[PDB]
């Protein structure tokens, strides 16, 4: 990937988009009712605190 942008408002939106994506995945996991989560791939500190 590569990001090309012209304005600071779009810059801020781009910054917010990644947090939105990660939180969307986390909420999708949470709303299923699961109480234990296991993964083969790294679980970040943000995910751990969430």
């Amino acid at each position: 990937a590569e990001i090309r942008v012209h304005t600071v408002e779009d810059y801020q939106a781009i910054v917010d988009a990644e947090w939105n994506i990660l939180y969307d995945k986390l909420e999708k996991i949470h709303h299923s009712g699961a109480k234990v989560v296991l993964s083969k791939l790294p679980i970040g500190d943000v995910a751990t605190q969430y």
Partner: protein, 149 residues
């Protein structure tokens, strides 16, 4: 992917939020299109992806990966199928038929078997059991001489 170098370029946030979802939906559509024809087992000669494996398991598709570039041709001769150089749902003429396909264990060895009931077939295999690799090699040479005779 493209043969030439490619790059995903994004100028807004909606594209960033939609790219992965679109890719996953496209892969799901392709796999279900393959599965709709009635295929039970897919044989490939190269790498498999995690998402493709996930959808194949979802739709109850047996996936076998063999890689010699000659074993693939021999299997095609055995079953009656034609190798497809692009990932597209096969036509009936390109579809192979085998009676039994399974995984078995013989003497600490995991094997995958494609088996017919036909007495003719196209090819056949001889499974040798011995207590020593040298003895098995000698029996192999004897079998070769018999075939040549």
């Amino acid at each position: 992917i493209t043969e030439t170098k490619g790059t995903v370029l994004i100028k807004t946030a909606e594209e960033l939020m939609n790219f992965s979802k679109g890719e996953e939906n496209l892969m799901d559509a392709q796999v279900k299109a393959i599965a709709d024809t009635g295929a039970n087992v897919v044989v490939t000669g190269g790498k498999v992806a995690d998402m493709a494996l996930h959808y194949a398991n979802k739709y109850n598709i047996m996936l076998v990966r063999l890689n010699s570039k000659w074993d693939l041709r021999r299997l095609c001769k055995t079953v009656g199928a034609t190798a497809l150089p692009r990932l597209t749902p096969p036509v009936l003429e390109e579809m192979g038929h085998c009676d039994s396909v399974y995984l078995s264990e013989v003497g600490d060895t995991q094997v995958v078997v494609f088996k017919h009931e036909k007495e003719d077939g196209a090819i056949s295999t001889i499974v040798l059991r011995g207590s020593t690799d040298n003895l098995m090699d000698d029996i192999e040479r004897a079998v070769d001489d018999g075939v040549n005779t």
